[PDB]
Design a protein around this ligand. Structure first.
Ligand SMILES: CC(=O)N[C@H]1[C@H]([C@H](O)[C@H](O)CO)O[C@@](O)(C(=O)O)C[C@@H]1O
Lengths: 581, 583, 587
């Protein structure tokens, strides 16, 4: 026939809901009477789900299968999983109803177009779901032959003609591993995840069913790097983040049931779905490795008013390969222990003071504290810089007074600390007694003993709460200095402890310009009196971006500036300490 | 007791719905509360489908079993296939309900009658489905013992007493095969296909379930001739006709659900059903072989207001073996390719002209045409007579411009042609471009070369469409002539081409009386005037009504005429045209 | 925290309905739209029925498991049997709904308390059922993280705190065996038979399902003596009584469906249940042997308003082990043939007379005689000289099936309704009983230390003896003089009869009398007194006193010396297992 398409070969979906010549009653039917309900159903499986190919000299079976499976639903992978369906009809209160069952199919075609004419067409019918036809009858009644017997193939829904030409944001995340739940109800384009379509006539019911007769599910997986982020590695990380236990099996049942009102015909399309997880290796403000894992989920059901079988068919082009999300928007970001980095434990709940010895690759220390309190945590001479995380949902399970219970959690929430191994720093942090925490100690280039010290702070240092504290040690006589670190998020703090150059006579003073380069924030500056440490507040509410303001500070005296980020413009925060006469 | 039955031994069904003394609560029950619905059910199979025999000296267990199974439902056969049932009850807001399950049974009996007295009685209870009784209750409430505990066997339905004394049409079809769908919802007499009955209490619901826990179905099959129509051959024929694929298995579930109103108890009975196919080998007006295939189908359920468990029991004799149809009237006739006959193909679509060389036995030629048109199809000198069929549902699938696509259809509607050795004919038929067709060439007795000629007709010959034209030769100058052929069906056509005797001079005539003997029909008469691209037809008389017609008409000597007959009344398998000449 | 408990180790149930940190969405969810219904559920078995242990030095996995399973539901045994659950939600017109599935757990704890402080806690999450949360959303719209993601474990129901400290009526029945159905819907205390709990969101539906993927059930049995009443013996008694066949399997399906109103969330608790059977050996007024047999049944569904999860947790001691009946009140008492006693049969239906000869040895064992009669009527039945005393029972449900004119049909029924007769080694009596032609009866002859030849006589009675229908008649034969006399027998039940045939002392001359005081001691009854006259036409009971109120009656009557009277007693107040009749004779 005639067609407005450039010359070439096209794969075509003509839609679901096709029934086949002559094959109407081959499954039998039911006779119900007098207000009773009949429910007839079936299960599309291996042996009753036979595709029927109608090839042509240019388009053989193989060519057809390949071109259809490339663009449309892969019916070979789909056909080992039993999918059920059922229809319900109620008989009138003084009449008999005859209902019979027929398999439906999707019609695919391969067409050759020369000069706006289709000069060859191959057809493939792919098993889909089913259709019930019923009629009310009395003894005697002559019923039209066509109720029982179809002379020519046809669609019980509206036909389609969907074709394809055949050819030939600052993320201030700490460095580490993240698993992100990006939400549910993902399907692929072009009906690749279509289970099937039922036509549910007025005052009847219809169901599409996943009964888990087999448990097999089919996850979808891609990776920027199969050496680091293999499928198995990605599954282990999903396990660490969300305790996903089953990847390619499920016992979880789903089905969709639709009762069509009086005087309305309904179309129910049912789809397989996935829940989309991202596994990212995040370093220095960028994605270094990324894997996508589409976990098999529990379906999507589209209900439309059933259009005419007869309305005109609009030739439409297929979408690009890809995914459509039909579930709600969602982004859950969960850090995970890097399994290449070993976990050491402190079994004693920390009291007031504790010292952990370190005989080397990065590793974690798991620990808890006896009483909620602010803690200073540092290595010896403040090297290396540490990070600390919360084990997520820890501390709600097993407990023992004065000791650690490892409740086995590798989902971690970053609190504070830099990925600057060789920067001097100490952490100051509020630690809740009913949680477990991880210290991360980075890669050291050393032979020496090192120690992590934990000290409950009950003094002024408390006012540096939830802060890493950088120790500046290279303040020259005058001139400009900058210190670049990973920026904390908005409302999160970073702190700098520095000695003004020169000898202390309590009289000699230098001018100090404290400003940031990219990010806005609030500074609180404090004189250190060295009791622990006493902090005298000497400048509040400083506003740091590009600030020109100047303050005079005592030579050889020690100060700490606390910075609350307020504007996150850049992954990095760069503090300047410029000193003059 | 007294009974009005002649002396002898009888098997009796006293019906379904029997419940057994003391065994009320041995399956347990459910307690539901405060708006919740409880659903209790079971599955009748193997171990819980063990009958209870109660023999007497004259009637042992083998004798009870055999006599019961010969006349009523075979309970051994049916035990294999799990049948399910369930009952649903909703507790009212803020009350508690108790619902308990009991199996029901069919009670069979063997009785010996003498001088109108039952002197001996054996009993068999065959497990059927089950029954749930419910009661609302308050804490500490006294319940009647009879609610919980039955002291004597009884029927919860009306009893039956169905007994048996123990001893000691013109088919105008072309020769070939036909499968016929005679409809759905068939059952055997005497409750042989009864699945079961539920009593459903007011304000509750009940279901009978075929869950396909095993897939086995049981077709019923008869044949006149297992040599030719075996079961397997009959099944392949069904496959050819309707693409039937599964004969003794099914994944198709069926279930019946009934909700009793507030004000009455309901009875639901459910039956296994069959769809009935007839396969016939039809030759020269008679059925020569015939098999019946009863394909397992998806059930029948009958819903009655529950009769009173104390209404009058009327003694009734068992019906003859047979089938009742509870589905709607249906007759679908599908011709099928005879598998013993080979298929050849013309691979190029026919346009204006084609000559097919015949490579003997009957065979088919599968072919298509390029553009819907009228075709004249004949063999050399019109011998032998050919037939032509439509492949049903062909042409809607694969297509290639100018060529045949075989969509492998063996289901055929006859269009026209004769089974008639020695009778010269040619076909004139409307062929649609989006169908394939089968020519059938019959058994030929000669070893000379023959060709099938195909010709697109653009002119008058189009007036003969959907008919075969019998060539009649050598009418004599005076008196009676007649020709018997297979009758077309009502509204189909047969044609005759005949030459008036005598020399053509465009003037001399003879008086021609045209009539049929048995069947009624309408005759259109054409005079043939011949050109070198084929015949011109002059319609000289329409609506001649042919049965024993006395009308005559003067026709030109030496001239060729064609009579096209539309059959209007099919009284005889054959039609007989008379040509009686006077003047 | 601080805790008002005494020192020691405790097992604690913190309730069903716990959901776990982070795992909320790992089974997937469903998106439904427009009018459609989504039904999401699962099946709790082996791989997804694995517990999560969080142990401590003092409380290891095995200690936790064992101490929990002792007091609370045994999840290891219940782990084999698939229990199904499903939730159903209907998306409104022109809207989309997302609904996701999460497993629920019972949270159990072992705690060490010292000085009103919990100093150690181990935790066990046992897989229970599941929970489906749903939300309305628009395509492209965000939902808050807390809908999707739980940071800390919590209970979606109200929590509980149920702890246990860990430590390292006259029965007027004839002598014989009885199986008693005490009713249905029994569960054990402390949620030992809890199948699971569903929180059902407003406007949705939830269902708990026993689909019998496995057929196994688990009866509960306890006996006072395993030598007499073993489990096998008790089951065989249940078979005799109610024809119970399957004790530890079932193909019987049950499921509960609960639809929550538009307005409130609902909580459904499903339980396995049992039917309580008592097997007793009853002798001279006392239960001498007893078994209890809890036969697995078809469950119990309790529907309650979903209590707030933020509800005040009140620390409560567990109940003692035992049972709670949720089904309706029921007591069905079925006598059973004692299998230690032999059954003889009279194969011919009895007509108007029959004699059945009984042999004697030094020590005759008790035995039964199964028989039937040809004509409905009243029968007199006794041994020779009315010794020993006999009992008669009806075979329950007999006579409804196989039949052969004139013969007994043994329809094999060991379930028996006591009609009348005494267990009294020393009492002479005969029986007077309405027998139905369409029924089998059993006579029980007791153990007799006699070795004499005896016979059981059966006689159809059409005269006055019918006034005594359904009683035993005690032959008193020691009224040898003036003086106090009493006679202790098993009391009939209320509205049943006991009779007494007695001869006044002295020579008969139709004139002489002595004074007779008739009364009972413990039970009230109504007496009818007849003179027995034996004339040419035959025998007659002459009614001489009616509606005599016997309990401590001070009425006295003059009765003829050497004449025979019969006192029929209808028991009206069953105060005592025995009825004590006095016959005090003065001049
Ligand atoms: C001897 C007498 O007058 N009465 C006695 C009776 C009878 O001898 C028997 O019961 C007859 O069967 O026996 C008793 O045990 C009793 O029944 O309480 C004690 C009572 O003193």
């Amino acid at each position: 026939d005639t067609i407005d398409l450039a010359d070439g070969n096209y794969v075509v979906s003509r839609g679901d809901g096709w029934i086949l010549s002559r094959q109407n009653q081959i499954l039998g039917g039911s006779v119900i009477s007098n207000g009773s309900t009949g429910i007839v159903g079936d299960l599309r499986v291996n042996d009753n789900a036979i595709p029927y190919y109608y090839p042509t000299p240019s388009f053989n079976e193989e060519y057809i299968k390949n071109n259809i499976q490339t663009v449309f639903a892969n019916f070979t992978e789909a056909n080992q999983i039993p999918i059920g369906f059922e229809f319900s009809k109620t008989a009138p209160s003084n009449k008999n109803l005859y209902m019979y069952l027929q398999y439906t199919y999707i019609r695919y075609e391969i067409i050759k177009v020369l000069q706006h004419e289709i000069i060859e067409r191959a057809v493939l019918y792919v098993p889909s779901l089913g259709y019930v036809k019923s009629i009310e009858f009395n003894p005697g009644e002559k019923i039209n032959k066509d109720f029982y017997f179809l002379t020519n193939d046809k669609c019980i829904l509206n036909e389609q003609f969907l074709y394809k030409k055949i050819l030939e944001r600052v993320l201030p995340y700490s460095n580490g591993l993240y698993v992100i739940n990006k939400g549910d109800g993902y399907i692929r384009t072009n009906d690749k995840d279509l289970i099937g379509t039922l036509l549910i006539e007025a005052g009847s019911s219809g169901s599409i069913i996943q009964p888990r007769l087999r448990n097999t599910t089919r996850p979808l997986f891609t990776t920027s790097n199969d050496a680091k982020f293999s499928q198995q590695y990605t599954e282990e990380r999903l396990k660490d983040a969300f305790n996903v236990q089953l990847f390619n099996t499920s016992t979880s049942l789903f089905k969709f049931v639709e009762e069509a009102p009086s005087n309305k015909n309904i179309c129910i399309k049912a789809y397989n779905t996935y829940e989309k997880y991202e596994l990212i290796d995040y370093q220095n403000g960028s994605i270094v490795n990324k894997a996508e894992y589409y976990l098999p989920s529990l379906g999507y059901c589209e209900v439309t008013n059933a259009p005419s079988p007869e309305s005109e068919v609009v030739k439409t082009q297929v979408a690009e390969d890809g995914f459509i999300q039909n579930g709600p928007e969602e982004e859950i970001v969960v850090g995970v222990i890097d399994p290449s980095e070993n976990i050491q434990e402190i079994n004693t709940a920390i009291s007031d003071n504790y010292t952990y010895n370190i005989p080397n690759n990065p590793f974690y220390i798991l620990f808890t504290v006896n009483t909620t309190g602010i803690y200073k945590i540092n290595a010896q001479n403040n090297l290396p810089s540490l990070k600390i995380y919360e084990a997520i949902g820890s501390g709600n399970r097993n407990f023992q007074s004065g000791n650690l219970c490892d409740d086995d959690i590798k989902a971690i929430n970053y609190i504070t600390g830099f990925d600057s191994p060789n920067a001097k720093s100490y952490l100051v942090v509020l630690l809740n007694k009913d949680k477990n925490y991880y210290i991360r100690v980075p890669q050291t280039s050393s032979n020496i003993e090192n120690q992590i010290k934990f000290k409950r702070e009950e003094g002024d240092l408390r006012n540096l709460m939830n802060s890493s504290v950088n120790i500046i040690d290279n303040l020259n006589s005058t001139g400009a200095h900058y210190y670049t670190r990973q920026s904390p998020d908005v409302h999160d703090y970073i702190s700098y402890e520095f000695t003004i150059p020169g000898n202390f006579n309590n009289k000699d003073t230098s001018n100090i310009r404290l400003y940031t380069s990219y990010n806005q924030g609030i500074g609180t500056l404090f004189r250190v009196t060295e009791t622990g440490y006493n902090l005298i507040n000497i400048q509040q509410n400083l506003n740091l971006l590009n600030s020109t303001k100047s303050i005079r500070l005592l030579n050889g005296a020690i100060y700490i500036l606390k910075v609350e980020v307020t504007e996150l413009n850049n992954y990095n925060i760069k503090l300047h300490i410029d000193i003059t006469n």
